[PDB]
Amino acid sequence: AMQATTTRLVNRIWGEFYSNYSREIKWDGESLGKTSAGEPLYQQALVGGEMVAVGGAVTLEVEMPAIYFVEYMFEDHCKMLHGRFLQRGSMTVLGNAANERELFLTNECMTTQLKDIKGVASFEIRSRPWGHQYRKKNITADKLDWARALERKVKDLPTEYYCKSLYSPERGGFFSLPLSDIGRSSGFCTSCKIREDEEKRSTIKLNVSKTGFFINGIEYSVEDFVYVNPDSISFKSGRNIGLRAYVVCQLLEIVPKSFDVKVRRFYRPEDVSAEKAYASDIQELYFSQDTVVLPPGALEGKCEVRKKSDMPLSREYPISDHIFFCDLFFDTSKGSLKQLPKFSTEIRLATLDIFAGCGGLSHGLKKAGVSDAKWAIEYEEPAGQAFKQNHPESTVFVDNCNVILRAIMEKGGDQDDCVSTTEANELAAKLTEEQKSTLPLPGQVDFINGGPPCQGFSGMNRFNQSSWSKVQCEMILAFLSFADYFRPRYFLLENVRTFVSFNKGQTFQLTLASLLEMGYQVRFGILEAGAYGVSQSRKRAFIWAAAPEEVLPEWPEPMHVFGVPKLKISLSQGLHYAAVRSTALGAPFRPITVRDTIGDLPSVENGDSRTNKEYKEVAVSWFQKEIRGNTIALTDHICKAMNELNLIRCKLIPTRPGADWHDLPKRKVTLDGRVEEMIPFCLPNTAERHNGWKGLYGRLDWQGNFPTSVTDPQPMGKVGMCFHPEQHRILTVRECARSQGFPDSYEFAGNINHKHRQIGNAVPPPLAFALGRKLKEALHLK
DNA sequence: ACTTACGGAAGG
DNA sequence: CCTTCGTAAGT
Ligand SMILES: Nc1ncnc2c1ncn2[C@@H]1O[C@H](CSCC[C@H](N)C(=O)O)[C@@H](O)[C@H]1O
Ligand SMILES: [Zn+2]
């Protein structure tokens, strides 16, 4: 319940949203060259007295006039000018959080006569050096710039605009300026060439040798292995049943018609039965002799099909390899599976994890090879204990982030740049010298990640205007202040999907506006955790930020079928951005089900409290072999104890898909001597406004998926689906951890409520691993 | 320390 | 027009 401790930059950005806020036209000079069409190229000109030059900006009438950064000028004797659009900040995803003097370069350009220019706008390109050591100089320069801008605005003088980033709504973010590709004055525009290449890579182009084509840039050819959409050849938490994956085919022939492709076919284990898909590798295929003639537009990508001997030695949980293996033959007519009677042949960053929790993000990030987890901050004792247990080489501060930040800023001597409450200062002054000597200092942290609390942004929160929820939503400012003070090379933020829509997006827009103020490149997206190898409907919003000299990571490619449409962020002007595709209509791998996740764990009764057990059966599914590994000790296979009435209700729920409280008979039970009603009073009382409370007192489906992991699985909770598919009990701690992708060797601390809170709060380790892989690729790109 | 009671907006 | 996805008050 502490007000966030912030630097003055973040405090100034958020303002009131912070609780603790404190006609003559003539060429100038000679020519310098000619275009490919023999047109002289000039660099300087005069248009009615005002001066136009390559690298400046010009104005066109449109309501505010449009601004165009001049790329080149040339001459019919008609004077011409090519310019790239400079979008204003208010017309971007920033909205009302943008400055009135900042312009963003876009990939849209136009050619216009010099007579159409309304005037010349004072325009500069801003490129400040990056580093924590330039913060004070940047602060002084920004104060001077603000004073000059206010002075000019008082006297009604023309505005002076600056540009430091390029706005990509198609890539969804703000990237670094290609300073070497703009203002060349050579008759060649990079955006024009990019547009031409994008237009070219869209049509059907049969190759010269009549053996392949160029669908969407991909160069398919005969004997290649391709993906085909399965359509071209429900209850709560069970919407993935009936969803099929990509049909893997071999390009056999190019049948002339403007042509068609004749392909063979491969069968997956799930095409035989659901029991065969359970006990089978996710990358297994069956040879068949069925050929289909398809249009060339039905192909969805390329893959490799090997034998079991030539499969890659490295095995990862989040599978990013488009490699399958074929060993058996599926007879379509008989339905049998027989044997086969042309297949295929340093950067670790010192990391600070704020709001660490039990270490779900840190585990995946450091498993990918990009994070060190050198420092962690987590103010809850059980979660900090779990983090220390799972990352023994990490320095964990079990303290408020607003106190750790105050201690860090006070250690560095920047007490005048800290906006903190008296309580934060008093608690920071009460830190022993041992902890104040191991605190991180700016220049030692190259990566800051972590997810601030989402309980104030979640749509479940009925009371999101209370003091507690308003304080929880204020932890964004402390995270941004950590990023501003330390200035790491990379920055990662995770929150709920509703974080981008909360308060009309004003919290989201004010976040990017902060990161852009520090001089970052910011990109945003929304990812579904169930498309990366878990049986869970978990939609999370991610924000990547990088220094101007670094490369922004790409988004991981989902490889599992999941019944979730495209998750779009609304930018502005009716535009939307989807970070990744939707795998509902096809993906390389089949969805993970509940039985694949928790099918092999031994049965336990209600209220089991044995924290140490032994595995009874061996792993069967592909998930169980990957989630257990070499673990021989079963930990935290314990479930919460239900009272007599709740246990009585649980035993009367049928063990069939779609079962919930609607199947409870209407009768009076006697427990003690108390007489109660079997059906809870609150469920039919407000069922009309809550979709009938579907899923409450509901069992999981063996072929479905787990619902969203909450910090307190209850029978009568907004989720509801917490009962075992076959056992009269709630899901154990270990089962809820497996549903989140946690390896069986992971440890949790506290009582059962603390462990459940730890699991329900954590980022799925597979998603963190995928993000870390993308970050590793970005780091190697530099 | 548990158990019950339960609003409304963003996307489709 | 369904389909998602935690905090307070009462024992
Ligand atoms: N002000 C604060 N200072 C430090 N930790 C905080 C905090 N406010 C909330 N937290 C912690 O942040 C955690 C949620 S973030 C979840 C942990 C992490 N994202 C993961 O993937 O595992 C909670 O457990 C809470 O204890
Ligand atoms: Zn151009």
PDB file of N, CA, C and O in Angstrom, chain A residues 643-702:
ATOM      1  N   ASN A 643     -14.827 -28.340   2.608  1.00  0.00           N
ATOM      2  CA  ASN A 643     -15.651 -28.678   3.756  1.00  0.00           C
ATOM      3  C   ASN A 643     -16.646 -29.779   3.389  1.00  0.00           C
ATOM      4  O   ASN A 643     -16.665 -30.295   2.268  1.00  0.00           O
ATOM      5  N   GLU A 644     -17.483 -30.148   4.362  1.00  0.00           N
ATOM      6  CA  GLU A 644     -18.421 -31.246   4.157  1.00  0.00           C
ATOM      7  C   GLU A 644     -19.410 -30.935   3.040  1.00  0.00           C
ATOM      8  O   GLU A 644     -19.671 -31.783   2.179  1.00  0.00           O
ATOM      9  N   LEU A 645     -19.958 -29.719   3.029  1.00  0.00           N
ATOM     10  CA  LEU A 645     -20.957 -29.363   2.026  1.00  0.00           C
ATOM     11  C   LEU A 645     -20.342 -29.293   0.633  1.00  0.00           C
ATOM     12  O   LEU A 645     -20.918 -29.800  -0.337  1.00  0.00           O
ATOM     13  N   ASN A 646     -19.173 -28.660   0.512  1.00  0.00           N
ATOM     14  CA  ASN A 646     -18.526 -28.552  -0.792  1.00  0.00           C
ATOM     15  C   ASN A 646     -18.102 -29.918  -1.315  1.00  0.00           C
ATOM     16  O   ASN A 646     -18.207 -30.187  -2.518  1.00  0.00           O
ATOM     17  N   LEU A 647     -17.615 -30.792  -0.432  1.00  0.00           N
ATOM     18  CA  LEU A 647     -17.263 -32.143  -0.856  1.00  0.00           C
ATOM     19  C   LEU A 647     -18.501 -32.930  -1.268  1.00  0.00           C
ATOM     20  O   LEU A 647     -18.451 -33.725  -2.214  1.00  0.00           O
ATOM     21  N   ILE A 648     -19.622 -32.725  -0.570  1.00  0.00           N
ATOM     22  CA  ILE A 648     -20.869 -33.382  -0.953  1.00  0.00           C
ATOM     23  C   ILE A 648     -21.306 -32.925  -2.339  1.00  0.00           C
ATOM     24  O   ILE A 648     -21.721 -33.736  -3.175  1.00  0.00           O
ATOM     25  N   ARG A 649     -21.214 -31.619  -2.605  1.00  0.00           N
ATOM     26  CA  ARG A 649     -21.563 -31.109  -3.928  1.00  0.00           C
ATOM     27  C   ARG A 649     -20.622 -31.648  -4.999  1.00  0.00           C
ATOM     28  O   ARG A 649     -21.053 -31.960  -6.114  1.00  0.00           O
ATOM     29  N   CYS A 650     -19.328 -31.753  -4.681  1.00  0.00           N
ATOM     30  CA  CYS A 650     -18.351 -32.191  -5.674  1.00  0.00           C
ATOM     31  C   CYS A 650     -18.616 -33.620  -6.132  1.00  0.00           C
ATOM     32  O   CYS A 650     -18.488 -33.930  -7.322  1.00  0.00           O
ATOM     33  N   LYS A 651     -18.978 -34.507  -5.205  1.00  0.00           N
ATOM     34  CA  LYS A 651     -19.202 -35.903  -5.560  1.00  0.00           C
ATOM     35  C   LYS A 651     -20.439 -36.107  -6.425  1.00  0.00           C
ATOM     36  O   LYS A 651     -20.576 -37.175  -7.031  1.00  0.00           O
ATOM     37  N   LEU A 652     -21.332 -35.124  -6.501  1.00  0.00           N
ATOM     38  CA  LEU A 652     -22.553 -35.244  -7.286  1.00  0.00           C
ATOM     39  C   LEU A 652     -22.449 -34.597  -8.659  1.00  0.00           C
ATOM     40  O   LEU A 652     -23.430 -34.609  -9.408  1.00  0.00           O
ATOM     41  N   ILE A 653     -21.298 -34.032  -9.006  1.00  0.00           N
ATOM     42  CA  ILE A 653     -21.077 -33.500 -10.347  1.00  0.00           C
ATOM     43  C   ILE A 653     -20.676 -34.657 -11.254  1.00  0.00           C
ATOM     44  O   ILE A 653     -19.694 -35.355 -10.964  1.00  0.00           O
ATOM     45  N   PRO A 654     -21.405 -34.907 -12.340  1.00  0.00           N
ATOM     46  CA  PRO A 654     -21.056 -36.030 -13.218  1.00  0.00           C
ATOM     47  C   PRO A 654     -19.683 -35.845 -13.846  1.00  0.00           C
ATOM     48  O   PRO A 654     -19.243 -34.727 -14.117  1.00  0.00           O
ATOM     49  N   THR A 655     -19.004 -36.968 -14.075  1.00  0.00           N
ATOM     50  CA  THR A 655     -17.673 -36.958 -14.680  1.00  0.00           C
ATOM     51  C   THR A 655     -17.777 -37.021 -16.205  1.00  0.00           C
ATOM     52  O   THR A 655     -17.335 -37.966 -16.857  1.00  0.00           O
ATOM     53  N   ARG A 656     -18.382 -35.984 -16.766  1.00  0.00           N
ATOM     54  CA  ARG A 656     -18.546 -35.842 -18.202  1.00  0.00           C
ATOM     55  C   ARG A 656     -18.187 -34.416 -18.589  1.00  0.00           C
ATOM     56  O   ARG A 656     -18.251 -33.507 -17.755  1.00  0.00           O
ATOM     57  N   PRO A 657     -17.778 -34.195 -19.838  1.00  0.00           N
ATOM     58  CA  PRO A 657     -17.479 -32.826 -20.280  1.00  0.00           C
ATOM     59  C   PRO A 657     -18.704 -31.930 -20.183  1.00  0.00           C
ATOM     60  O   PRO A 657     -19.832 -32.354 -20.441  1.00  0.00           O
ATOM     61  N   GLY A 658     -18.470 -30.675 -19.805  1.00  0.00           N
ATOM     62  CA  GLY A 658     -19.536 -29.704 -19.691  1.00  0.00           C
ATOM     63  C   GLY A 658     -20.341 -29.768 -18.413  1.00  0.00           C
ATOM     64  O   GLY A 658     -21.350 -29.064 -18.302  1.00  0.00           O
ATOM     65  N   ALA A 659     -19.933 -30.585 -17.446  1.00  0.00           N
ATOM     66  CA  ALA A 659     -20.654 -30.689 -16.188  1.00  0.00           C
ATOM     67  C   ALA A 659     -20.292 -29.531 -15.268  1.00  0.00           C
ATOM     68  O   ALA A 659     -19.130 -29.124 -15.186  1.00  0.00           O
ATOM     69  N   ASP A 660     -21.294 -29.003 -14.576  1.00  0.00           N
ATOM     70  CA  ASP A 660     -21.109 -27.867 -13.681  1.00  0.00           C
ATOM     71  C   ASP A 660     -22.240 -27.882 -12.653  1.00  0.00           C
ATOM     72  O   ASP A 660     -22.921 -28.899 -12.484  1.00  0.00           O
ATOM     73  N   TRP A 661     -22.434 -26.754 -11.966  1.00  0.00           N
ATOM     74  CA  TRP A 661     -23.410 -26.684 -10.883  1.00  0.00           C
ATOM     75  C   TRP A 661     -24.840 -26.908 -11.359  1.00  0.00           C
ATOM     76  O   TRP A 661     -25.720 -27.162 -10.532  1.00  0.00           O
ATOM     77  N   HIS A 662     -25.095 -26.818 -12.666  1.00  0.00           N
ATOM     78  CA  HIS A 662     -26.439 -27.042 -13.184  1.00  0.00           C
ATOM     79  C   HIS A 662     -26.918 -28.476 -12.995  1.00  0.00           C
ATOM     80  O   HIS A 662     -28.118 -28.730 -13.135  1.00  0.00           O
ATOM     81  N   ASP A 663     -26.020 -29.409 -12.686  1.00  0.00           N
ATOM     82  CA  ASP A 663     -26.377 -30.805 -12.486  1.00  0.00           C
ATOM     83  C   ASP A 663     -26.562 -31.161 -11.017  1.00  0.00           C
ATOM     84  O   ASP A 663     -26.729 -32.340 -10.691  1.00  0.00           O
ATOM     85  N   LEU A 664     -26.532 -30.177 -10.127  1.00  0.00           N
ATOM     86  CA  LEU A 664     -26.734 -30.440  -8.708  1.00  0.00           C
ATOM     87  C   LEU A 664     -28.222 -30.601  -8.417  1.00  0.00           C
ATOM     88  O   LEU A 664     -29.011 -29.712  -8.751  1.00  0.00           O
ATOM     89  N   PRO A 665     -28.641 -31.710  -7.811  1.00  0.00           N
ATOM     90  CA  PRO A 665     -30.062 -31.885  -7.499  1.00  0.00           C
ATOM     91  C   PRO A 665     -30.530 -30.903  -6.440  1.00  0.00           C
ATOM     92  O   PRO A 665     -29.772 -30.489  -5.560  1.00  0.00           O
ATOM     93  N   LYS A 666     -31.805 -30.532  -6.534  1.00  0.00           N
ATOM     94  CA  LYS A 666     -32.412 -29.608  -5.581  1.00  0.00           C
ATOM     95  C   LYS A 666     -32.900 -30.398  -4.374  1.00  0.00           C
ATOM     96  O   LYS A 666     -33.930 -31.077  -4.441  1.00  0.00           O
ATOM     97  N   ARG A 667     -32.165 -30.312  -3.269  1.00  0.00           N
ATOM     98  CA  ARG A 667     -32.508 -31.047  -2.060  1.00  0.00           C
ATOM     99  C   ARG A 667     -31.838 -30.369  -0.874  1.00  0.00           C
ATOM    100  O   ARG A 667     -30.950 -29.527  -1.033  1.00  0.00           O
ATOM    101  N   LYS A 668     -32.277 -30.749   0.322  1.00  0.00           N
ATOM    102  CA  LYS A 668     -31.725 -30.237   1.568  1.00  0.00           C
ATOM    103  C   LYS A 668     -30.878 -31.318   2.223  1.00  0.00           C
ATOM    104  O   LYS A 668     -31.322 -32.463   2.362  1.00  0.00           O
ATOM    105  N   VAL A 669     -29.664 -30.953   2.624  1.00  0.00           N
ATOM    106  CA  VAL A 669     -28.726 -31.884   3.236  1.00  0.00           C
ATOM    107  C   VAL A 669     -28.568 -31.535   4.708  1.00  0.00           C
ATOM    108  O   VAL A 669     -28.768 -30.389   5.128  1.00  0.00           O
ATOM    109  N   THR A 670     -28.219 -32.548   5.498  1.00  0.00           N
ATOM    110  CA  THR A 670     -27.965 -32.402   6.926  1.00  0.00           C
ATOM    111  C   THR A 670     -26.515 -32.790   7.190  1.00  0.00           C
ATOM    112  O   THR A 670     -26.130 -33.946   6.987  1.00  0.00           O
ATOM    113  N   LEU A 671     -25.718 -31.827   7.638  1.00  0.00           N
ATOM    114  CA  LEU A 671     -24.303 -32.067   7.894  1.00  0.00           C
ATOM    115  C   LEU A 671     -24.071 -32.490   9.341  1.00  0.00           C
ATOM    116  O   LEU A 671     -24.030 -33.680   9.651  1.00  0.00           O
ATOM    117  N   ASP A 672     -23.097 -32.636  12.553  1.00  0.00           N
ATOM    118  CA  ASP A 672     -23.129 -31.239  12.967  1.00  0.00           C
ATOM    119  C   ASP A 672     -24.561 -30.820  13.291  1.00  0.00           C
ATOM    120  O   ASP A 672     -24.804 -30.090  14.251  1.00  0.00           O
ATOM    121  N   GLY A 673     -25.508 -31.297  12.485  1.00  0.00           N
ATOM    122  CA  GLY A 673     -26.910 -31.007  12.666  1.00  0.00           C
ATOM    123  C   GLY A 673     -27.444 -29.887  11.797  1.00  0.00           C
ATOM    124  O   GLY A 673     -28.666 -29.735  11.693  1.00  0.00           O
ATOM    125  N   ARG A 674     -26.566 -29.102  11.179  1.00  0.00           N
ATOM    126  CA  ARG A 674     -27.008 -28.016  10.317  1.00  0.00           C
ATOM    127  C   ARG A 674     -27.707 -28.562   9.080  1.00  0.00           C
ATOM    128  O   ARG A 674     -27.319 -29.598   8.532  1.00  0.00           O
ATOM    129  N   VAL A 675     -28.746 -27.858   8.641  1.00  0.00           N
ATOM    130  CA  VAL A 675     -29.485 -28.200   7.432  1.00  0.00           C
ATOM    131  C   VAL A 675     -29.238 -27.097   6.413  1.00  0.00           C
ATOM    132  O   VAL A 675     -29.537 -25.925   6.670  1.00  0.00           O
ATOM    133  N   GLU A 676     -28.694 -27.472   5.259  1.00  0.00           N
ATOM    134  CA  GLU A 676     -28.348 -26.522   4.212  1.00  0.00           C
ATOM    135  C   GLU A 676     -28.935 -26.981   2.886  1.00  0.00           C
ATOM    136  O   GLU A 676     -29.475 -28.082   2.766  1.00  0.00           O
ATOM    137  N   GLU A 677     -28.836 -26.113   1.885  1.00  0.00           N
ATOM    138  CA  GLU A 677     -29.313 -26.406   0.542  1.00  0.00           C
ATOM    139  C   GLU A 677     -28.154 -26.863  -0.333  1.00  0.00           C
ATOM    140  O   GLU A 677     -27.055 -26.306  -0.267  1.00  0.00           O
ATOM    141  N   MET A 678     -28.407 -27.889  -1.149  1.00  0.00           N
ATOM    142  CA  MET A 678     -27.365 -28.415  -2.025  1.00  0.00           C
ATOM    143  C   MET A 678     -26.911 -27.364  -3.030  1.00  0.00           C
ATOM    144  O   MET A 678     -25.710 -27.125  -3.198  1.00  0.00           O
ATOM    145  N   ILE A 679     -27.856 -26.726  -3.703  1.00  0.00           N
ATOM    146  CA  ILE A 679     -27.525 -25.673  -4.665  1.00  0.00           C
ATOM    147  C   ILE A 679     -27.181 -24.400  -3.898  1.00  0.00           C
ATOM    148  O   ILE A 679     -27.969 -23.973  -3.040  1.00  0.00           O
ATOM    149  N   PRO A 680     -26.028 -23.784  -4.157  1.00  0.00           N
ATOM    150  CA  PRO A 680     -25.711 -22.513  -3.495  1.00  0.00           C
ATOM    151  C   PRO A 680     -26.754 -21.459  -3.828  1.00  0.00           C
ATOM    152  O   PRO A 680     -27.298 -21.426  -4.932  1.00  0.00           O
ATOM    153  N   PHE A 681     -27.044 -20.598  -2.851  1.00  0.00           N
ATOM    154  CA  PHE A 681     -28.089 -19.598  -3.041  1.00  0.00           C
ATOM    155  C   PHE A 681     -27.675 -18.537  -4.053  1.00  0.00           C
ATOM    156  O   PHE A 681     -28.513 -18.036  -4.810  1.00  0.00           O
ATOM    157  N   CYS A 682     -26.389 -18.185  -4.085  1.00  0.00           N
ATOM    158  CA  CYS A 682     -25.947 -17.068  -4.910  1.00  0.00           C
ATOM    159  C   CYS A 682     -25.903 -17.404  -6.395  1.00  0.00           C
ATOM    160  O   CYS A 682     -25.868 -16.486  -7.219  1.00  0.00           O
ATOM    161  N   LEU A 683     -25.901 -18.684  -6.758  1.00  0.00           N
ATOM    162  CA  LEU A 683     -25.711 -19.036  -8.160  1.00  0.00           C
ATOM    163  C   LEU A 683     -26.983 -18.803  -8.977  1.00  0.00           C
ATOM    164  O   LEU A 683     -26.924 -18.086  -9.983  1.00  0.00           O
ATOM    165  N   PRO A 684     -28.145 -19.360  -8.605  1.00  0.00           N
ATOM    166  CA  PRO A 684     -29.364 -19.034  -9.361  1.00  0.00           C
ATOM    167  C   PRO A 684     -29.882 -17.635  -9.091  1.00  0.00           C
ATOM    168  O   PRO A 684     -30.713 -17.141  -9.863  1.00  0.00           O
ATOM    169  N   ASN A 685     -29.427 -16.987  -8.016  1.00  0.00           N
ATOM    170  CA  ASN A 685     -29.889 -15.639  -7.706  1.00  0.00           C
ATOM    171  C   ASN A 685     -29.462 -14.643  -8.777  1.00  0.00           C
ATOM    172  O   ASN A 685     -30.250 -13.780  -9.179  1.00  0.00           O
ATOM    173  N   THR A 686     -28.219 -14.745  -9.250  1.00  0.00           N
ATOM    174  CA  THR A 686     -27.673 -13.819 -10.235  1.00  0.00           C
ATOM    175  C   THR A 686     -27.210 -14.541 -11.497  1.00  0.00           C
ATOM    176  O   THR A 686     -26.313 -14.069 -12.196  1.00  0.00           O
ATOM    177  N   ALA A 687     -27.814 -15.694 -11.801  1.00  0.00           N
ATOM    178  CA  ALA A 687     -27.407 -16.451 -12.980  1.00  0.00           C
ATOM    179  C   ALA A 687     -27.808 -15.752 -14.272  1.00  0.00           C
ATOM    180  O   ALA A 687     -27.166 -15.955 -15.308  1.00  0.00           O
ATOM    181  N   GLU A 688     -28.861 -14.933 -14.235  1.00  0.00           N
ATOM    182  CA  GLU A 688     -29.362 -14.319 -15.460  1.00  0.00           C
ATOM    183  C   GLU A 688     -28.392 -13.291 -16.026  1.00  0.00           C
ATOM    184  O   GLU A 688     -28.295 -13.143 -17.249  1.00  0.00           O
ATOM    185  N   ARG A 689     -27.671 -12.575 -15.167  1.00  0.00           N
ATOM    186  CA  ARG A 689     -26.736 -11.552 -15.616  1.00  0.00           C
ATOM    187  C   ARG A 689     -25.306 -12.058 -15.741  1.00  0.00           C
ATOM    188  O   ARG A 689     -24.410 -11.263 -16.041  1.00  0.00           O
ATOM    189  N   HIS A 690     -25.064 -13.347 -15.522  1.00  0.00           N
ATOM    190  CA  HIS A 690     -23.714 -13.897 -15.538  1.00  0.00           C
ATOM    191  C   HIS A 690     -23.654 -15.169 -16.368  1.00  0.00           C
ATOM    192  O   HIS A 690     -22.931 -16.114 -16.038  1.00  0.00           O
ATOM    193  N   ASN A 691     -24.421 -15.212 -17.458  1.00  0.00           N
ATOM    194  CA  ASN A 691     -24.426 -16.328 -18.402  1.00  0.00           C
ATOM    195  C   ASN A 691     -24.764 -17.658 -17.735  1.00  0.00           C
ATOM    196  O   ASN A 691     -24.358 -18.719 -18.219  1.00  0.00           O
ATOM    197  N   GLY A 692     -25.504 -17.624 -16.631  1.00  0.00           N
ATOM    198  CA  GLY A 692     -25.836 -18.835 -15.912  1.00  0.00           C
ATOM    199  C   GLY A 692     -24.730 -19.388 -15.046  1.00  0.00           C
ATOM    200  O   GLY A 692     -24.860 -20.515 -14.554  1.00  0.00           O
ATOM    201  N   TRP A 693     -23.653 -18.632 -14.839  1.00  0.00           N
ATOM    202  CA  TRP A 693     -22.498 -19.070 -14.057  1.00  0.00           C
ATOM    203  C   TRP A 693     -21.958 -20.398 -14.586  1.00  0.00           C
ATOM    204  O   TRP A 693     -21.778 -21.371 -13.851  1.00  0.00           O
ATOM    205  N   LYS A 694     -21.711 -20.423 -15.892  1.00  0.00           N
ATOM    206  CA  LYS A 694     -21.220 -21.632 -16.538  1.00  0.00           C
ATOM    207  C   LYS A 694     -19.803 -21.942 -16.075  1.00  0.00           C
ATOM    208  O   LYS A 694     -18.946 -21.054 -16.025  1.00  0.00           O
ATOM    209  N   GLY A 695     -19.559 -23.205 -15.737  1.00  0.00           N
ATOM    210  CA  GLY A 695     -18.268 -23.659 -15.285  1.00  0.00           C
ATOM    211  C   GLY A 695     -18.110 -23.720 -13.781  1.00  0.00           C
ATOM    212  O   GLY A 695     -17.140 -24.315 -13.300  1.00  0.00           O
ATOM    213  N   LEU A 696     -19.032 -23.126 -13.027  1.00  0.00           N
ATOM    214  CA  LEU A 696     -18.920 -23.132 -11.577  1.00  0.00           C
ATOM    215  C   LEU A 696     -19.240 -24.520 -11.040  1.00  0.00           C
ATOM    216  O   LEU A 696     -20.191 -25.168 -11.486  1.00  0.00           O
ATOM    217  N   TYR A 697     -18.440 -24.972 -10.072  1.00  0.00           N
ATOM    218  CA  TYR A 697     -18.498 -26.352  -9.590  1.00  0.00           C
ATOM    219  C   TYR A 697     -18.353 -27.329 -10.752  1.00  0.00           C
ATOM    220  O   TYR A 697     -19.001 -28.376 -10.800  1.00  0.00           O
ATOM    221  N   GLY A 698     -17.483 -26.983 -11.697  1.00  0.00           N
ATOM    222  CA  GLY A 698     -17.362 -27.702 -12.950  1.00  0.00           C
ATOM    223  C   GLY A 698     -16.087 -28.517 -13.022  1.00  0.00           C
ATOM    224  O   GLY A 698     -15.046 -28.120 -12.495  1.00  0.00           O
ATOM    225  N   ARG A 699     -16.177 -29.665 -13.684  1.00  0.00           N
ATOM    226  CA  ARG A 699     -15.046 -30.561 -13.863  1.00  0.00           C
ATOM    227  C   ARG A 699     -14.284 -30.210 -15.133  1.00  0.00           C
ATOM    228  O   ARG A 699     -14.849 -29.691 -16.099  1.00  0.00           O
ATOM    229  N   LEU A 700     -12.988 -30.503 -15.123  1.00  0.00           N
ATOM    230  CA  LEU A 700     -12.198 -30.372 -16.333  1.00  0.00           C
ATOM    231  C   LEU A 700     -12.529 -31.501 -17.305  1.00  0.00           C
ATOM    232  O   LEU A 700     -13.093 -32.534 -16.933  1.00  0.00           O
ATOM    233  N   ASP A 701     -12.170 -31.293 -18.566  1.00  0.00           N
ATOM    234  CA  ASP A 701     -12.368 -32.281 -19.614  1.00  0.00           C
ATOM    235  C   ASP A 701     -11.025 -32.897 -19.971  1.00  0.00           C
ATOM    236  O   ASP A 701     -10.033 -32.180 -20.130  1.00  0.00           O
ATOM    237  N   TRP A 702     -10.995 -34.229 -20.083  1.00  0.00           N
ATOM    238  CA  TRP A 702      -9.748 -34.918 -20.397  1.00  0.00           C
ATOM    239  C   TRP A 702      -9.170 -34.460 -21.729  1.00  0.00           C
ATOM    240  O   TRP A 702      -7.946 -34.406 -21.888  1.00  0.00           O
TER     241      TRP A 702
END
